[PDB]
Design an enzyme around this catalytic site. Structure first.
Site, short mmCIF file in Angstrom:
data_model
loop_
_atom_site.label_atom_id
_atom_site.label_comp_id
_atom_site.label_asym_id
_atom_site.label_seq_id
_atom_site.Cartn_x
_atom_site.Cartn_y
_atom_site.Cartn_z
N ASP A 177 -0.20 49.10 38.84
CA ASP A 177 0.73 48.58 39.84
C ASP A 177 0.44 47.16 40.29
OD1 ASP A 177 2.43 48.29 41.89
OD2 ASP A 177 1.76 50.11 42.96
N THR A 178 1.14 46.19 39.66
CA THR A 178 0.89 44.79 39.98
C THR A 178 1.36 44.44 41.39
OG1 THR A 178 3.02 44.09 39.02
CG2 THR A 178 1.08 44.06 37.57
N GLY A 179 2.22 45.29 41.98
CA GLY A 179 2.70 45.05 43.33
C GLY A 179 1.80 45.60 44.39
C1 LIG Z 1 9.39 49.55 46.11
C2 LIG Z 1 9.74 51.00 45.78
C3 LIG Z 1 10.90 51.01 44.76
C4 LIG Z 1 10.10 51.81 47.02
N1 LIG Z 1 8.58 51.63 45.14
C5 LIG Z 1 7.37 51.65 45.71
O1 LIG Z 1 7.11 51.11 46.79
C6 LIG Z 1 6.36 52.43 44.88
C7 LIG Z 1 6.24 53.87 45.39
C8 LIG Z 1 5.26 54.63 44.49
C9 LIG Z 1 5.02 56.03 45.05
C10 LIG Z 1 4.34 56.03 46.42
C11 LIG Z 1 3.05 55.21 46.42
C12 LIG Z 1 3.44 53.78 45.95
C13 LIG Z 1 3.92 53.87 44.49
C14 LIG Z 1 4.15 52.47 43.92
N2 LIG Z 1 5.07 51.76 44.81
C15 LIG Z 1 5.19 50.36 44.35
C16 LIG Z 1 4.05 49.52 44.91
O2 LIG Z 1 3.87 48.41 44.03
C17 LIG Z 1 4.29 49.04 46.35
C18 LIG Z 1 5.37 47.96 46.45
C19 LIG Z 1 5.25 47.19 47.78
C20 LIG Z 1 4.71 45.93 47.81
C21 LIG Z 1 4.56 45.24 49.01
C22 LIG Z 1 5.04 45.83 50.18
C23 LIG Z 1 5.57 47.10 50.13
C24 LIG Z 1 5.71 47.80 48.95
N3 LIG Z 1 3.02 48.59 46.94
C25 LIG Z 1 2.41 49.17 47.95
O3 LIG Z 1 2.80 50.16 48.56
C26 LIG Z 1 1.09 48.49 48.37
C27 LIG Z 1 0.09 49.55 48.88
C28 LIG Z 1 -1.22 48.83 49.24
N4 LIG Z 1 -1.92 48.36 48.22
O4 LIG Z 1 -1.58 48.68 50.41
N5 LIG Z 1 1.34 47.51 49.43
C29 LIG Z 1 0.93 46.24 49.37
O5 LIG Z 1 0.19 45.78 48.52
C30 LIG Z 1 1.45 45.39 50.54
C31 LIG Z 1 1.42 44.02 50.48
C32 LIG Z 1 1.86 43.28 51.60
C33 LIG Z 1 2.43 43.96 52.66
C34 LIG Z 1 2.91 43.26 53.76
C35 LIG Z 1 3.37 43.95 54.88
C36 LIG Z 1 3.37 45.34 54.90
C37 LIG Z 1 2.87 46.05 53.82
C38 LIG Z 1 2.39 45.36 52.69
N6 LIG Z 1 1.94 46.03 51.63
#
Ligand SMILES: CC(C)(C)NC(=O)[C@@H]1C[C@@H]2CCCC[C@@H]2CN1C[C@@H](O)[C@H](Cc1ccccc1)NC(=O)[C@H](CC(N)=O)NC(=O)c1ccc2ccccc2n1
Ligand SMILES: [Cl-]
Ligand SMILES: [Cl-]
EC number: 3.4.23.16
Lengths: 99, 103
Positions: free
Chosen positions: B29-31
Site C-alpha cells: 500500500d503506497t498510500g
Molecule cells: C481510499 C479507499 C478507497 C477508501 N480505500 C482505502 O482507504 C483502503 C481501505 C483498505 C481496507 C481498510 C484498511 C485500509 C486498506 C487500504 N486503504 C488504502 C490506504 O492506502 C489508505 C488511503 C488513505 C491515505 C491517506 C488518508 C486516508 C486514506 N491509507 C491509510 O488508511 C493510511 C493508514 C495509516 N498508515 O495510518 N493513512 C495514512 O497514511 C494517512 C496519511 C495522512 C493522513 C492525514 C490526515 C488523516 C489521516 C491520514 N492518514
C-alpha cells in the site's frame, strides 16, 4: 515515472478545471477526492477505509489528468483528508509497483 | 522478474508475509505511511497510538524493530497492531524492499 517511497507519492492532478495534489495509492480500490463540484451526474456510494465507512458521491466517466496522463473513469467525492488516486485510474495510466 | 516482480494493479496487490512466525496475506500500500496488521501477538514493549485514514481513527499498539518477510524480501521496522480490516504494508517497509511506482 520512477517514484521511490521514502516520501508520500504525491502528484499533480487536473480535474474539473483545477490543479490539485493527490496520492498515488496502490492500496485503494477507488479514487476519492475532497469536496468539489464536478461536471457530471452522481449517484450515492458507501466506501470503507481504516476506520469505517463514509458516504461519497460517485461520478462516472470523469476526465482527470494524473501526472500528465489522461484517464477517464470513476471519481468519488467525499470527506477524505487526502485526494487519493486508486487502482481504477492507476491502471489507466499504466502504473505498476516494482520491486 | 520472479525475485523482483513488477506488479500490475488490475487486482489488489496482495502478497504473503511472514511476521511473528506466522504467514499472513497483506496489501502492498503506497498510500499508507505505516504498516498495520490485524490483532496478533508480538514480543517486546509497545506504546498505544491513534492512526487515521478514510472513516476516522483506530487505536493500535506500536511495536518497533520488527522483522518481516514480504514476498520473500526481508524488512525491518515499526509494525502497528490493531483493528484494521485488512493487513497493509505501508511505505515504512515498502522502502526496505526497494519498491517503486513506475508509469
Ligand atoms: C481510499 C479507499 C478507497 C477508501 N480505500 C482505502 O482507504 C483502503 C481501505 C483498505 C481496507 C481498510 C484498511 C485500509 C486498506 C487500504 N486503504 C488504502 C490506504 O492506502 C489508505 C488511503 C488513505 C491515505 C491517506 C488518508 C486516508 C486514506 N491509507 C491509510 O488508511 C493510511 C493508514 C495509516 N498508515 O495510518 N493513512 C495514512 O497514511 C494517512 C496519511 C495522512 C493522513 C492525514 C490526515 C488523516 C489521516 C491520514 N492518514
Ligand atoms: Cl473507473
Ligand atoms: Cl519504521
Amino acid at each position: 515515472p520512477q517514484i521511490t517511497l521514502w516520501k508520500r507519492p504525491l502528484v499533480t492532478i487536473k480535474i474539473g478545471g483545477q490543479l490539485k495534489e493527490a496520492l498515488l495509492d496502490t492500496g485503494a480500490d477507488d479514487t476519492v477526492i475532497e469536496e468539489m463540484s464536478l461536471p457530471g451526474r452522481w449517484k450515492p456510494k458507501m466506501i470503507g477505509g481504516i476506520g469505517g465507512f463514509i458516504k461519497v458521491r460517485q461520478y462516472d466517466q470523469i476526465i482527470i489528468e494524473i501526472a500528465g496522463h489522461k484517464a477517464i473513469g470513476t471519481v468519488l467525492v467525499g470527506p477524505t483528508p487526502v485526494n487519493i488516486i486508486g487502482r481504477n485510474l492507476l491502471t489507466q495510466i499504466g502504473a505498476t509497483l516494482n520491486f
